[PDB]
């Protein structure tokens, strides 16, 4: 103890879960996981950067699910966007229900 070797932090586990939900009998190498972690960080940054600009453009001090949504429409191509807006909208609907 005392001097703890820092502490990284990735999406590796949430990734692995998703891999199970779609490919129960499929595994993943350490290198491919690194690629998946980059992808997630990359997408996150791209989406928030837009929402941030949307917020600024419209002189608003807050990033809501509305800026996340149209940021998604600007960043993602056709079909991927339509679906993504489906999952996001659904998550928000469900999440608010849960009390």
């Amino acid at each position: 103890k005392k001097r703890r070797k820092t502490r990284k932090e990735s999406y590796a586990i949430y990734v692995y879960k998703v891999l199970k939900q779609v490919h129960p009998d499929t595994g993943i190498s350490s290198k491919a996981m690194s690629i998946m972690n980059s992808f997630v960080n990359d997408v996150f940054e791209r989406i928030a950067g837009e929402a941030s600009r949307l917020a600024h453009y419209n002189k608003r001090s807050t990033i809501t699910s509305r800026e996340i949504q149209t940021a998604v429409r600007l960043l993602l191509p056709g079909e991927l966007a339509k679906h993504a807006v489906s999952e996001g909208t659904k998550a928000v609907t469900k999440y608010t229900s849960a009390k």
Partner: protein
Amino acid sequence: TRSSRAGLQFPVGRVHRLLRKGNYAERVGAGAPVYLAAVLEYLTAEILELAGNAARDNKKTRIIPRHLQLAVRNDEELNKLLGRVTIAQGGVLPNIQSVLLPK
């Protein structure tokens, strides 16, 4: 956890922490990290779904970089989204221009 309340595998709390530390805006609404976490999840679900089949077609139970590269490049939209990205150890889609082939 907010994820459960939202039916997501992806960390809604973490995403919320990251949205506040990245200096994107003075404030972050409550639904923003949920919506973003869902999208992130969908997209990684979408990739793994296709990379998995590439692993299958190549007869391997383990997804490797090369499989993620095939899934991405054989998919019009993912190829567009990652048009400026290079997947290390991904190689390229086998492709020889017709006129180069022997009759």
